[PDB]
Amino acid sequence: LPALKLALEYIVPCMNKHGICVVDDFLGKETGQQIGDEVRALHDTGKFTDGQLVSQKSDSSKDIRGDKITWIEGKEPGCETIGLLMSSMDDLIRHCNGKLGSYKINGRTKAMVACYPGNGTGYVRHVDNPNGDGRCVTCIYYLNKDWDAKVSGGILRIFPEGKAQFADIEPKFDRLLFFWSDRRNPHEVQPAYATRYAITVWYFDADERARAKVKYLVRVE
Numbered sequence: 001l002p003a004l005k006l007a008l009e010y011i012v013p014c015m016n017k018h019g020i021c022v023v024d025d026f027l028g029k030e031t032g033q034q035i036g037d038e039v040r041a042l043h044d045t046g047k048f049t050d051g052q053l054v055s056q057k058s059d060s061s062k063d064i065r066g067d068k069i070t071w072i073e074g075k076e077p078g079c080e081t082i083g084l085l086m087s088s089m090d091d092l093i094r095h096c097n098g099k100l101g102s103y104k105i106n107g108r109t110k111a112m113v114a115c116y117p118g119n120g121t122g123y124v125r126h127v128d129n130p131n132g133d134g135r136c137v138t139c140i141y142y143l144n145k146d147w148d149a150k151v152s153g154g155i156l157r158i159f160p161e162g163k164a165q166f167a168d169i170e171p172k173f174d175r176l177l178f179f180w181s182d183r184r185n186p187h188e189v190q191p192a193y194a195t196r197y198a199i200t201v202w203y204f205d206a207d208e209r210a211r212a213k214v215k216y217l218v219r220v221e
């Protein structure tokens with residue numbers, strides 16, 4: 001799909017109605033696999049952090065750590081396909097501007113590449129931007145081939161506001177997900193029992209970000 005067709009025929013109407021939108025087979029197998037290879041290279045060469053401290057025990061030798069991250073600009077050697085993903089995300093958002101709510105997106109974060117190492121850790125229920133920091137849309141790309149949650153866990157569970165039933169999303173290879181970053185979309189990552197990779201960028205609303213600068217006295221493109 002041309003980015004503009006995906007944007008106009010799906011992302012815009014989907015976001016305005018549900019605020020959570022899934023695009024499968026975003027970039028295709030070849031490109032997805034090359035992204036996977038770049039992320040695994042980052043992992044194998046020690047570019048991720050050691051992981052979120054989950055359980056801090058009296059003895060530090062068996063401390064439990066969870067999600068590992070690394071921040072990627074997209075131009076680094078060995079990260080050019082990641083950069084290409086980011087550009088593709090940006091192109092989609094561009095074609096959506098003026099149509100995602102009343103927001104006006106004028107920048108984004110660098111990419112946060114996350115690895116849940118497969119040791120039964122997940123991520124607690126949270127809101128990405130609960131305090132008005134400028135971020136209006138979360139965009140995440142999943143890289144996990146033949147991921148089977150029945151077996152490997154790692155489901156994203158989102159709980160929209162005032163709705164009784166949550167939504168479970170598998171972190172499937174070449175899946176792109178958009179959702180509003182604010183309190184409309186509390187979510188969590190259920191425990192993962194296999195290595196689980198994803199890449200997130202957050203898009204900023206111009207007005208919210210401009211006045212966040214005041215109240216809190218890292219944005220590109």
Ligand SMILES: C[C@H](NC(=O)c1nc(Cl)c2ccccc2c1O)C(=O)O
Pocket residue numbers: 067069114123126127128140155156171187188189198
């Ligand atoms: C979408 C979900 N991930 C998150 O909700 C998620 N959210 C935040 Cl705010 C994270 C922050 C630091 C490191 C990993 C994070 C993280 O992973 C997922 O991976 O499916």
Ligand SMILES: [Fe+2]
Pocket residue numbers: 126127128187
């Ligand atoms: Fe999150």
